[model samples]
Target: KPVKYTAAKLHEKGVLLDIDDLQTNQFKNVTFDIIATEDVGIFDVRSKFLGVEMEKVQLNIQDLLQMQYEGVAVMKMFDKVKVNVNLLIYLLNK
Candidate 1:
């Protein structure tokens, strides 16, 4: 099977991520983290649900940044179904 991954670019605000294949019951309570190099520090992160009703969610910014890696962002989804989302990873301007 061929998997498709979108390309994200660095913007003045931050990097925009497009995540797909989130339309299954198995991913209802899925949690994932994004990592970046030391050069690009993760400042903040946000998520926007597309084509589905939004549910209660938790965004962990502190723990992710404090991780062993350079830049890290965590996304915890609760009660999500049949939808996609755009993650905006805010980075330090340097």
Candidate 2:
């Protein structure tokens, strides 16, 4: 089997994550990973969720199921986001 992922870069710099768990669901986990890098410090950032996460992007969770299904799957009842940041050192090295 082959697995693939997608990155939505046209999104927020500081991500606000929301996750939910679903039981007895064997099709979708409703999970997602968020990766990000910031050239600025945490204090110099701001964030907010303008709308429902589902409104922004549409993902193909069906493929994840593929085949071989079972009961009580660890389904993600809501959107799960993973956030990360990286600051660039444009200044002189310390």
Candidate 3:
């Protein structure tokens, strides 16, 4: 099932995750969306440990960014991954 979460709601009390996190809800299961009038704040995804058997994972903004991504492609936002998708986005509708 394709699901979505308001970026603000998820960031309000959400935890950063990895494929392993989704492997067990490694958090890869949650699709976060940013929809608001103010910046929610920045979070960190510290580890690039994609967990075992990983590939095609990415970070998405207006454009698509990914590496070694295939079979399954998941994109999320976090701090400092440009080296490896250190995903980050900022927008305020207000």
- Give model 2's TM-score versus the native structure: 0.19
Clashing pairs in 2: 20-77, 29-76
lDDT of 1 at 11: 20
Distance (Å) between predicted and true CA of 43, model 1? 13
Regions of model 3 farther than 4 Å from truth: 1-20, 24-28, 38-86, 90-94
Off by over 4 Å in 2: 1-21, 24-27, 39-52, 55-94
CA RMSD of each candidate after superposition: 12.1, 16.5, 12.1
What shift in Å separates residue 55 of candidate 3 from its native position after superposition? 26
**All candidates' TM-scores?**
0.26, 0.19, 0.21
Give the alpha carbon lDDT tens digit for every residue of 1-94 in model 2: 1121222331232221222242314113232333222422211111223222342332223322331144222332224433321111111011
Evaluation by TM-score, superior candidate among 2 and 3: 3
Residue pairs with backbone overlap in model 1:
none
Cα TM-score of candidate 3: 0.21
**Leading candidate by TM-score:** 1
Clash counts for all predictions: 0, 2, 13
